[PDB]
Amino acid sequence: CQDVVQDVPNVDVQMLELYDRMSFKDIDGGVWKQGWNIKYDPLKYNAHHKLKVFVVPHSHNDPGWIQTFEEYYQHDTKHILSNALRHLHDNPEMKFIWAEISYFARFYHDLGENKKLQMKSIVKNGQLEFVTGGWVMPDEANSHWRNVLLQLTEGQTWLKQFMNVTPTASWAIDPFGHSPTMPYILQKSGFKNMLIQRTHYSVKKELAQQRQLEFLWRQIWDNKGDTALFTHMMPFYSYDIPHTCGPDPKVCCQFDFKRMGSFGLSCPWKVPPRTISDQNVAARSDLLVDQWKKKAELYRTNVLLIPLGDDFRFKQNTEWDVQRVNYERLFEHINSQAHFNVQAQFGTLQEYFDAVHQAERAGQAEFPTLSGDFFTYADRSDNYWSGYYTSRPYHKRMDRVLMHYVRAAEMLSAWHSWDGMARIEERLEQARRELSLFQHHDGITGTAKTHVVVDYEQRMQEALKACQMVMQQSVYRLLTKPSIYSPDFSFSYFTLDDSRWPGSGVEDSRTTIILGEDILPSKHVVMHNTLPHWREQLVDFYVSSPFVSVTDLANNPVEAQVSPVWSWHHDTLTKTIHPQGSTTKYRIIFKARVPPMGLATYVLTISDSKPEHTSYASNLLLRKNPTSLPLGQYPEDVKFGDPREISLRVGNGPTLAFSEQGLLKSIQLTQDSPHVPVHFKFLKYGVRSHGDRSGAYLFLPNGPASPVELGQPVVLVTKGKLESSVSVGLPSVVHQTIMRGGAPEIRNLVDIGSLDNTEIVMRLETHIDSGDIFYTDLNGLQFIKRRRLDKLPLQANYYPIPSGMFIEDANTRLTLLTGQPLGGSSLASGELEIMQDRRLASDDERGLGQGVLDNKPVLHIYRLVLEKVNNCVRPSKLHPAGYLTSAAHKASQSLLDPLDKFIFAENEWIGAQGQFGGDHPSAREDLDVSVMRRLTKSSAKTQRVGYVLHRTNLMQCGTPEEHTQKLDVCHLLPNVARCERTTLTFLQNLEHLDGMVAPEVCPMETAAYVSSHS
């Protein structure tokens, strides 16, 4: 295994180093506004060395943006695809590329058999070629790597089944900035080439000057280069026709034949296209070939890529004709005029890359190596696209909840083969497709119109209901004696209980377990653990009495804590934000212990008085002018007091001190250690009154943030043996710090209300001497080093925080893990900050046509980990990566993949069992089974089950941490007959495994295996 910590890779371009050296001046470069006047030697190309030009027709189809997916399919995409089939069938030399498989599958299934056969023929003969082949062209900033793989697999599995092809070239022309997580996943899924477009205009200028726009993109920790993927970066401002034929858009626009008038389009540079004739073909070819030779100067081979397309193009039959016939006249002239030394033709993306590598093998070019990312993107001036790292935060959090429910539903139902009548495959396919659709670059990014955001929410709600159904039918089958098991596949045997989604204060969705001497004395509950190691975690349920005790299924008592159910209200009469307690529902909390990828059953029983093994929390309400707070049967009366500083400690854990406003002030790790200053603060950013305005994509603050005026907020303190917390009602945010014995959990109920043109940020202030360095993650896969640059504006120093961020000095580290992707930065030494929500009245000129005024309450969750790191073996100063400690990685897993909770729905569960999975191996803490999925239906003689195994890399800081068991996924199901290593999409077998044993992977590696069973 390669050492991902101690060896700094040697690459030609390292993006953090490039950023430190570049000036980023925005000067007028001439007709190529952000470049320079390109010059070329006409003698470079000649009879023995011609320029080969591939014009590649394409149509960018967004799966929702200004219209919903179905509205665009009906108004535009079904006509584009129907006319592509007719035109390619009738014109054998015409070509076309297609990226979004969600639309293609929606079209194909509605076609008659004759047309399905015609479509398969133009794919088999190479005229219509699929690029990437994912369900969508995903966002690369907020998306989790697990969902980028899920949508890639959904589209490529459909393509293999119905079109018999698997793309090896990727096309990503519209995501707002680019992530190395893409070549990581693509290279492990059979790809050989990829293309990107939206990178900072200063970066395109710098790389073009050095002819470094084509490069071997490897991971930042990869010393050997085995992760490398050939990448082509487009050079200009847009992927549209005016910015794809060459450097001068006033010239290129004249070669977009849809812009002469009858289609309602024109050229903003004021010179229109003109129909090619025998009297003007020579002068038009002279202008076009000059643009092509200028573009060719920016690259190393004699093969040139010329995309020809735009949004929802190639719709009308007349449009197909106007572009094809005019280009065919240009090619016939150009290719017959020897003085140009050019051979031009329509081509596909794979054809371009195959010709580039033929040139490389002929020794005509060598390519540079590169590592790093391409965030944060700016397309012009100071217009940095960091706003979408936060826009529509409710749906960003919903993405992570659904991510976990799809994993748990596929894993729980994979253990058995299911009758078709159970509709398991049907519900899982719907769930995978709705979550895959939301990975689109106007979905999770929060950049679609209001009614489109509603469509994505409705689709994800249906996906959550599908997951719940599959999960609860699976738990009933896994924990019921086989000869008693009697399923009704439409029945609800268990209901899921989720404490953090939609969350307290967002939706009253949780069911109370109703017990009573005159109705039901007890209730079974079951916990599932999707991770491959034994896990303990506190769990809570709402119950109708405080006198409840817990037992495991051997009837052993389990220690429990009961607390009140508190809800916060904006009292429009007293003009205060304060908590009200329930006098009939209570929370019971206890530690559940669950096997690796397994289930554990517990029982809740009522008694007439306080049970021996259940304790009750105390509650203290701090505010001036208090009024009584009755709690029905709860045995401890609420106490009151004026605001004051307070300190709390649960278990042997850290001791936390809070200000009289209920915000963290310091953390003391041990009995003896110092009280380290760690302060939470809420602030607000505004919008500029003149110039460009912030919107769904852009963050254009009117200066540094100003503190939110807090007034004298109401603070609630609950102190218990197993769990304690401090909660405070601040303007727009109910802020809560929860302690269970380790790093605290932070929850913010954020309601920006009617505060227009405001962005609310949560900042941490410390005295850690971090200087200008901080770390953020990429897609929940890896941590990359960031350097704050004062030569760039505040918004350029904002980066995506898809799952975590940290700052450190020689001795101390502060890590903030998140349960949802948000935007953030470190704007000064010792600080971390992350945006909570943003409400904007204006549109930001990127096509959305509205502001963001549809905010709704959202419950954000986090873990805050303060640690000493002086003993950890860390990368050297020049290494571009960082790595988490064991405690920080487990804290991230507690947020993204918590235990699942099920409440038995009827009065008596006949045949109930106590545990499932006690014999599953408990794997080392850095290893995860990211995906477990049965790949065959019940009628297959040979069953197949696929697994994706990921190992992260944790710092060695002196903790022995030993004895774990080897995890061989191929022997998790009985009667294994074969074990194969496959691509990550499970579509190609790469290795037949000896002894049917699947080896574990190396740190930072991801592998896929399929076991076959007789």
Ligand SMILES: C[C@H]1N[C@H](CN[C@@H](CO)c2ccccc2)[C@@H](O)[C@H]1O
């Ligand atoms: C974020 C947005 N980027 C693309 C914008 N496309 C351009 C035309 O090339 C456009 C289309 C419509 C209005 C303004 C600008 C869209 O595909 C969408 O995903």
Ligand SMILES: *[C@@H]1O[C@H](CO)[C@@H](O)[C@H](O)[C@H]1NC(C)=O
């Ligand atoms: C699918 O493609 C393969 C390419 O290896 C070909 O050999 C096979 O016959 C194809 N099957 C069809 C035509 O469905």
Ligand SMILES: [Zn+2]
């Ligand atoms: Zn788009």
